[PDB]
Amino acid sequence: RETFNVFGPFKQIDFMVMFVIKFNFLCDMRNFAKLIDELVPNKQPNMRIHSVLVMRDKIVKLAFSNLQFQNTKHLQRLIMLMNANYNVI
Amino acid sequence: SKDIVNEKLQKIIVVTDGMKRLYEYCNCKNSLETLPSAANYGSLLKRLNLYNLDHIEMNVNFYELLFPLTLYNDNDNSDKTLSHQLVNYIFLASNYFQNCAKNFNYMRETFNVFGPFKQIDFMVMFVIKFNFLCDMRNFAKLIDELVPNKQPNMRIHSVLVMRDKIVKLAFSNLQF
Amino acid sequence: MECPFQIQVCISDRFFAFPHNLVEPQSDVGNKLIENLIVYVPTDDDRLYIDKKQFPKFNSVLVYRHEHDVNIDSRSPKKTASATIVYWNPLVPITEIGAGETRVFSVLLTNNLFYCNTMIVHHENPKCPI
Amino acid sequence: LVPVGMAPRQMRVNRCIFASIVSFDACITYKSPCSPDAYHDDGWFICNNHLIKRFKMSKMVLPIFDNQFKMTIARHLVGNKERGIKRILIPSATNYQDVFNLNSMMQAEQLIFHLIYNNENAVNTICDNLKYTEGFTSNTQRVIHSVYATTKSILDTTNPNTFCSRVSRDELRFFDVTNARALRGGAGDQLFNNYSGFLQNLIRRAVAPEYLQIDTEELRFRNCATCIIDETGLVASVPDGPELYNPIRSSDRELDRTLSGYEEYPTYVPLFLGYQIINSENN
Amino acid sequence: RVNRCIFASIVSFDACITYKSPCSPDAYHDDGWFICNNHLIKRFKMSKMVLPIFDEDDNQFKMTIARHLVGNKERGIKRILIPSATNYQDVFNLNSMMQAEQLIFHLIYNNENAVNTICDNLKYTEGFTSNTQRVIHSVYATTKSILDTTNPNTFELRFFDVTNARALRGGAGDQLFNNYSGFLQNLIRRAVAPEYLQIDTEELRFRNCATCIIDETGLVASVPDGPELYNPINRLQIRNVLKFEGTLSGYEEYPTYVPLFLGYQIINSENNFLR
Amino acid sequence: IFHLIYNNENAVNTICDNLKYTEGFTSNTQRVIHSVYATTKSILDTTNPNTFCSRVSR
Amino acid sequence: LVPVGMAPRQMRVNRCIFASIVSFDACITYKSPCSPDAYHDDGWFICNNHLIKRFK
C-alpha cells in the first residue's frame, strides 16, 4: 500500500492495492486458462485437487480476514471478477 | 592497461547491443535468479540452430568478463552499498555459473526436448552466456558510467578470485 | 419414533445419484408454487454432484449439508413456506420442512424414515456383486 | 497338546524385510545383521542396519505440536563428494537392479528386491532356477517358500493401506519441490506413483514434507528441499546448487575450554521435500 | 573469573530496587561472546549453540551459532532480533527496563544523546552525588571497556547479505553490519553462521537456504520468502495427584530449531587454521 | 498508576499494549499488570462515586 | 476446604495506591517503601512515604 501510495494519496488506496494484487493474479489465471483451454473439463471437480483447493483457501481467507482494511460498466465487470462472482458477463 | 579494461567494458556493452539485433534475441527480461530454462528461448534456440555453434568455449573467463565492472568511482564515498551490490552481483554470477555447470546435463535434456539437434552441447552454453550477458547489460544500465582509468580494490579482487576458482573448476569438470 | 405426514419419502437404488428430474416445486396453502429449492445432502462433498442447472422449474436453488438441529424436535419440525425442501440420502432427523410436501429421496431406509407415512419404493431386478 | 485349537498367539514380530535373508545352501549357515529397532511395531518395515546398508539412510524423529506428536523422518548418510549413482538414495524400479548389485549379494535378497520392486519376471526366474538348483525338494524349497511368504505377507499388509492413503481425501501428500519455480523437482508425484505401494510407504515414512498444513495451521520445517526425486528414484541432491556438507562424524584446547557443556547443533541432513496436508489430528 | 556478562553490570542505584542479575554462568567463559546466554536470550531472543565443522580425529572446527526464539507468527518488531540504531529504541521498551540497562543499550548503539539525557535525569536522584554518580561511572566504564574490546580498530571476508538469491539487487545488509558497533558486529559474527564456507578453493554448504534476514530494520528471524519456519518451544496441587499406577520411543529426535544460518565466509590460502 | 489517577486513557492503553508485546506477558507479567490495574480501578471506583455525590451535595 | 462458600472475609487493607508498585520483570524482585499509616482506614488513599516522595 505504501509503495502504491508513492504515486499519490489515492482516495481508495486500499481497494486499489487489492485490485492490483487480484489483477496480477488474474494475468497468470488467464495464462493457465489458455494453457488448459484445449483440454476437456469434467462434469465434477477432481476430488484431490478440490481438497487441496479448499484447504489452501482456508489459510488464504484467514490471512486476508485477519488483515482488515479500509465509469461503471467495465469497472463493475472487473470488480465482479475480482470478487469471484463468476456470474459476471 | 586498466584503460584497455575500460575499453573492454565499453566494447562489451556495444557488442551486446550489436549481436542482440544482428541475431535479434535480447532475452533481456531474464536474469541470474536461477538455472535458465529453454521455455524462454524456444524461438531463440530455433534461430541459433541456423548457425554452427561449436565456436564456443567450455569454460567461462569469469575473471575477465566481470573485472571491468570493478572499475567505478568508488571514491564518491556516497554509495558503498554500490560496492556491496557489486559483491552480491559477482557472487550470484558465480553461483549461477556453478549451478549451470553442475546441471549442464539437465539443461542438455531440456534443450533435447527443445530442438533436439546435435549442436545442443553448444546451445546450452550459448543460452547460459547470452542470458548472463543480458543480465550484464541490465546491470550496466543500473550502474553509472563512473569508470576511472585505474582503481584498486583488494576485497573485490579477492572475492573475484575465490569465486572464479570454483567456477573454473566446475566448468573444467564438464568431461566428455 | 414418529414422523410428520408432510414428508414424503421415495426409496430407490437409483437414488445413489440424485434424481434431478423428480424434483418439483411445492405449492403453499394459496396454491402458489415456490420457485426456491433447498437440497439437503449428508456431506458437504455431495454438493458437487447437485447440478443447479437441472432445475428449470425453480428460480433459485441452494444446497446445504443436513445437520441435526438439536434445538428442534423431529416430532414437529419447523416449517419454511418460502422454499421447497428436498432431502437426499438423509442420515439425521429432518428438523425442517418445506411448502406443501417435503420430498425425500434415499437409497437407505433408516428408522427415521421407516415410520414416514408416505413411502414410495422403487423396485429393481436384483443383480448381486461378488 | 497345550494351546487351544488354533487360537493364533500374540507376540512381537521382526518387521524388517531383510531379516528373512538366509543361505539357500542349507549346509552353509548364515545370520543376517538386524538392528533391534526391527522389533518396534512402527511404520518402518526396514531395520536401521539394512536401511543404512542398502539405502544410505538413517531413521530419525521430528517432534510436532501442545501434544507432542512424533513424526518419523530419515536423514542422509550421503557424503558431500559422492556423485552419480552414489547419489541415488532409493533407486527406482528402472534402476534398482543396477544400483543394487544383485550379483554380489545373496539370491534370497535378490528375490526380496524383485518382490519389493514389482519385478514378477525376475521373481519367477529366481523361483524356477531354485526349483532346478540344489536339493530344492528337501529343504531349499521350503526355505524359499517361507521367505517368499514372509515378504508377500509384509507387502499385503502394506499395499492395501498404501492404496487407501493414495485415494484418501483427509490425508494428502505431494512429493515434489514446493518451490514450483524450480527444475529439479519435476513430476515427483508421478514418480512416487510409479513406485510400489510398499516403496511408497517407505518414502512416506522417510521423507518429511517441507510444509505441513494441519487443518488451518501450516508449519514450515524448511525454506528449501534437502532431497529430490527423479526417474532414478530418491536422489540425495540439492535441487538448487552445491551439495550439502555431510561430515559423517561417526559410524562408517581453548576451543573446548569455551565449548564445554554447551548446546550443539547436529550436522545431520534430514529429508525435507514436498507438501503435506491433513484434516484433524488422526493421531 | 572475568565476568563478561554485559547487562549484568547493572546496579539498582535506587535504594528501594534490588537487581537480582540472575544471568547465565557462561559469562565466565573466555569465548568470542561478550554477552552470556541468559542476557542473549532475554534481550535478543537467541540461544547459544555450536556447530561442529570438522570433527574426525583432532580437527575440531566448532563454529558457534545461536538459535531463533521467534515463532512462526511474530512479525515486524516482534520478529526483529538485533534492531538497527534507528529502531532499537522502539523495538526495546527502554522505559520498562532499568536506566542502567538503557545506558548500556545507548552506548552499544552510540546514542550519546540518550546517555547524556540519562545521566542528566540521574542528576536529580536523592543520593545522586553520593552513589548514583559512582554507579554511573562503574557501568559506563565497564560498557566502554567492553565496546573498545569488541571494536577491532581500537588500540575477515564474511559477507552476510551475500547469499540472497532472488533478491532484486543491492545487498547492503553488510552495509548496515558495517554501520553497527564493534560489539554488535562481533555479536553478529559470533551468533550467525554463514551458509557457505570456502577454504582455499573448497566450498562447504551447510544449508540449502539462509534462515536469517538483514535489512535496514536490523537482523530479523524472517525467511527469504514464503511463510515463517516452524519454531516451537512445586506446590503440590490436587491436579498434581496422578491416577492409578498404570510412539517412536526408540529413536533419537532431530531438533526443531532454527539456527542462525546466513552468509558466505571466504578463507584465503590459509589451511585448517586451528590456533 | 499515574495515567490512571490522572484520567489519561490514551497513556494507559499505550502502556497496556506495550506490556502485551513486551517480555513474557502471558506467563505472569499479564496477571501482575491486571492485578495492579484492578487494584487501582477498585480504589478509583470506591472514591469517584462518593466524590461526585459530594460535588452535587447541598 | 475451610472457609464457607465465598463468604468475603474481613481484614485490613493497604490503602495507598503506590503500594501496588511491583517490577514487571518477574526476575527482578522489588519492594515499594510504604509507611504503616497506609493501613489506617481513613480518607487518605496515599501513605505518608509516597505523599512526601511524590507530592512534597
Ligand SMILES: [Zn+2]
Ligand atoms: Zn533387520
Ligand SMILES: [Zn+2]
Ligand atoms: Zn505506601
